[PDB]
Design a protein around this ligand. Sequence first.
Ligand SMILES: Cc1cc2nc3c(=O)[nH]c(=O)nc-3n(C[C@H](O)[C@H](O)[C@H](O)COP(=O)(O)O)c2cc1C
Ligand code: SF4
Ligand code: SF4
Ligand code: SF4
Ligand code: SF4
Ligand code: SF4
Ligand code: SF4
Ligand code: SF4
Ligand code: FES
Ligand code: FES
Ligand SMILES: [Zn+2]
Ligand SMILES: [Zn+2]
Lengths: 118, 118, 118, 155, 118, 584
Amino acid sequence: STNSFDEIYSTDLIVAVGKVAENHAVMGAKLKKAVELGAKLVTINNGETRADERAIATYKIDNTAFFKATIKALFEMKAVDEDYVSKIAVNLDELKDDVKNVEVTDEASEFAKIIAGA
Amino acid sequence: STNSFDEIYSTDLIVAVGKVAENHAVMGAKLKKAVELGAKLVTINNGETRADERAIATYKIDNTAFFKATIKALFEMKAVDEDYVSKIAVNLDELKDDVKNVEVTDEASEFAKIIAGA
Amino acid sequence: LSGYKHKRYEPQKHPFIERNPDKCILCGLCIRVCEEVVGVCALGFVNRGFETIVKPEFGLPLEETSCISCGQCADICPTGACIGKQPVAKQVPVNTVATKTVCTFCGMGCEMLVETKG
Amino acid sequence: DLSLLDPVLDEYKGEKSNIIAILQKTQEIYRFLPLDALNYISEKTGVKKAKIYGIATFYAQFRLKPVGKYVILQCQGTACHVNGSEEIKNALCDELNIKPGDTTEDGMFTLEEVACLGCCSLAPVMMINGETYGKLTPDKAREIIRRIYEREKNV
Amino acid sequence: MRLVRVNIDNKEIFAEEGKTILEVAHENNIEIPHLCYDKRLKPYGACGLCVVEIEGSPKLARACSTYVTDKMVIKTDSPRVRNARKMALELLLSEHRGDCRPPCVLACPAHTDCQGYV
Amino acid sequence: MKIRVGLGSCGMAAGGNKVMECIQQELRSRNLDIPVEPTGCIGLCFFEPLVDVIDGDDVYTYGNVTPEMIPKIIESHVIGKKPLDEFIVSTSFEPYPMLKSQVRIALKNCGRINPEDIDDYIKNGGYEALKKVLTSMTPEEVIEEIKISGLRGRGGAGFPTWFKWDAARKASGDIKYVVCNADEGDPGAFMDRSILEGDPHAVLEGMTIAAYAIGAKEGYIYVRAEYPLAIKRLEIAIEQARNRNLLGNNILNTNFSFDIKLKKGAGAFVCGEETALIASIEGERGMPRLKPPFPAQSGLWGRPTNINNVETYANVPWIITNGGKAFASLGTEKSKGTKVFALAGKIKRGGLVEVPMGMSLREVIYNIGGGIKDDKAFKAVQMGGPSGGCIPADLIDTPVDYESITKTGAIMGSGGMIVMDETTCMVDIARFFLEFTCKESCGKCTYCRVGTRRMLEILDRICNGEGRDGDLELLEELAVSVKDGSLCGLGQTAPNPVLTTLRYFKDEYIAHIRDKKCPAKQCKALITYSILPEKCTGCGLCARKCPTKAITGERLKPHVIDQSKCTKCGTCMNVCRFGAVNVE
Ligand SMILES: Cc1cc2nc3c(=O)[nH]c(=O)nc-3n(C[C@H](O)[C@H](O)[C@H](O)COP(=O)(O)O)c2cc1C
Ligand code: SF4
Ligand code: SF4
Ligand code: SF4
Ligand code: SF4
Ligand code: SF4
Ligand code: SF4
Ligand code: SF4
Ligand code: FES
Ligand code: FES
Ligand SMILES: [Zn+2]
Ligand SMILES: [Zn+2]
């Protein structure tokens, strides 16, 4: 993990992927508390979760292509500072070529808008 | 002593009698802090003190009569609930007779007004 | 102040939590913790006034509701109207000694006090 | 049945603050509150089942059991009670052999005590399916019950 | 920060603004009864055991929901408060069915924990 | 020529609907074109159904009308062109004396307009206050006008309405709410229902003026669903007001925009509380919240909310039109204006009255109400209802005023006024009020949840003859503890009937406890029905009327009661015209 559990209470946006609350009920309580404190919750899952009650965006996906579309959408809105990313990351052109032919959906574009606005 | 040192920070009015700050410098600092916190300071002494700087009333007395007149003034302005004092205290009529013939001065009346208004 | 007293206790088959309405002081803590902290909201008030009781959803057994068996209701109860059964062969009210340790069943690393006797 | 609830739930969908209105419409549709209907309301409205049960059991207008054909709203306000309305309720209970709030085993009468019906000057007052009766008396109330029973039996 | 000054049971306390009387008294090791309070939940005011006498208020105030203000005088064990708590506890015991101790323990002259060791 | 029939809640409970149907049928069969309208309750609820025949500006109010008398009235007044004067009860030139000592402000239009026609309300100086406020009045000017008028409460503990409006206005928020208590609460009060059935437009206009003063854009009416007539008339009035640009977006072609949604209450005495009304509107169970935050600072869904009664909202247009000083020139130095009282109980003339503040209760009863039914004695007035108290005969001179009534241990309350004479037991009344309180308590705090029930148990023991000695002081201690420890006002005011009855009528409790006798002969377990052999005539009516067949005897021989199987239902007194049965 990159960050600690405390920073959850102070982050702007939370993206909960999978059965986060179902498999770990205390994390569901922590997400509830964080959303009450002022965070924004986005849940990505293949089925229903207890965290959907206070989520601003709920995505029921079954394939990774969703995220790929998101990436393409992130490039379309010019939300990726490619200078900084090229300085810090490699395989950026390969990523651009990989996601260039995917179809951006309404759900993926909305997710990209939520991500870029946080 | 009837009360504790902490209550000084929370009392409405402080009457410092004698060389309180001169003999006990830390008490002078405590009075300065209490007046800064919102209290009102009255210094009674026969000479100058370092507590006169932030005092609302400064009295330079040399005799106990100043207090007696004060008591008489407290009776004249009807600031003594004699019903309560008669139940809690004795020698009240003797006190009234003792202070009946004294002369109320402007300083004593001002002190009595300060006491009754706190 | 003695008179009519409810007798609404019914035996239940739940392996972990035992609820006795006859010992309930109607503080609401179980409902408030299932709603505000856990977020499952499996308990609620039923009836009104002297007839008020705390019941799971639709008066169903705790197993048949959305309860996730976390035990928070039994942990917050002040007066033994909701208890968590002891993992022993015969139930016995004993004075235990508590040691702090860490749950090892998922990565959230929740801490707990294990209360033992022997 | 769980089919007539669709328009009622659709006209109050999207807000979890209309639950009491949904319960009132459900009671209008089904003449009582069925547990399966409460399950459906909780599923579609998004409100927890515990809160649905709490609201349903908190308010006096909501009844969880079927109610007989005739409802006897026997007013028990201050004016009627001062004018001797307790004896009216006792007479009705003794005649129908049921306790207040219950329904006869025949499924015909359902005595329920209510607040002021507005017509204090006719105290005591009892209402049966819209019809009103005022200036009553235990004997008179028993006579009304007997006349209603005989009139219905003759049909 | 800015500190409020309170007097709880003749003890001068410098508390922090935004706390309730329950929290301030817990910090200063003053015991106020409470049965429906929890730090994770919003106040409820049900049990009425936390009532304290605040000078200047004719009605007893719930320590779990009342906030400490500057120059406050609080009594937590005055005869009025004790009578209120006793009446609330008697009312709670009115609707209570249980055995605090089993009849076997009560029939032993030495009050041996028969049930416990059995 | 017009015909009006009084269709209130009590109007259709006395046959008013059938009277209107018969009038319409007679007019149709006679081939006549005369308007027939419904109208609210004028206050003479003991004369319903009331038929007002209007010729130009003259109004003739026939009372106690019947379908058989309708053809005579129609053919002699509408066709005969002459008042009948035999069944006439009131007229514009000589009004009923019950309406001569009343100064009416909230009930100004009640019974004198058409509740289902906005044009009739407009014709009688209606909605002009809203026009004036929207044209040439600042919201601060409106608040100052209400402040000068001295309006306060009219159905509560009594608080300056201007203070609530200013507190709601000064609060920060994009959206503010303006709510109304159409709930009556007190079981025996019907002023709000009659006002909504006879003058819903006054409440609507008052709500709109309150919103303009506050800045609200949406308002709520909390009417109990048990009152279908009030709901129907309110819906009709709201639709008519909307269709005339008097409610909704761009009211009166200006930037103001206020709308009202009727929120039907499910039925609870606790729901009348502000923090419980808010919960009921929000969809949760009506459990009262704690005092911080206050409804004015944050009410419905965490936004500023101003909750007021129906009567205080009806008072607003009159204050705006006639000025604050005119409203403040009536009453006393503290309580100013008029108060609506629902007179009921053992009274000769009951119904809605509107009396100026400072009027003595003796003037309200013996001068307006006509005295006591059957000209019996007079024991007490229960002012306030379950939260109020019993003002006895010796305190009959207390003026109608919040402070004067409060000093007697009662409260002004919503305005219910139940007169109880010498045949009504005080212990039974306290027991009845406590039973109502226990059946309507929200059951959150143990003081109201258990204290009220235990007090009810003590009173039941006293009434049932099982009252152990040493229960008066324990009842008083329970009452004081419950009063000073409960959360909301239901429990803090529940002990009031017990506290008052134990102050002015303690000897009744002593007799119920010490002598085990009922001074008023009302509690069944403390009385006895006995037949004097001399007085009886052996007609057998009482014997045949017994549900338990207690009384047996021979013909023309004195009947003998069966005390073993006597349920003390009191049927003998009702059925024996010879005065043979004696209760003692
Ligand atoms: C238990 C209880 C029931 C109440 N019921 C009503 C009611 O039915 N109608 C009403 O106008 N006020 C009622 N109130 C008073 C309200 O608290 C509040 O005063 C009212 O909503 C508006 O006050 P107002 O007189 O200034 O308009 C009730 C109060 C309590 C404590
Ligand atoms: S165990 Fe947990 S989920 Fe189940 S009722 Fe108790 S608090 Fe709610
Ligand atoms: S926490 Fe215990 S005492 Fe409180 S309401 Fe729940 S079951 Fe009753
Ligand atoms: S660590 Fe995981 S399994 Fe253990 S209590 Fe916490 S959430 Fe449950
Ligand atoms: S220990 Fe507590 S819950 Fe158990 S019987 Fe005693 S008082 Fe009641
Ligand atoms: S006094 Fe307490 S129990 Fe009674 S209605 Fe108010 S909050 Fe509920
Ligand atoms: S009181 Fe009723 S039961 Fe008793 S004798 Fe009279 S009629 Fe019969
Ligand atoms: S009604 Fe009166 S007179 Fe007739 S039998 Fe009964 S007691 Fe005798
Ligand atoms: S109290 Fe019963 S009709 Fe008014
Ligand atoms: S802890 Fe229960 S009222 Fe405060
Ligand atoms: Zn009427
Ligand atoms: Zn009696």
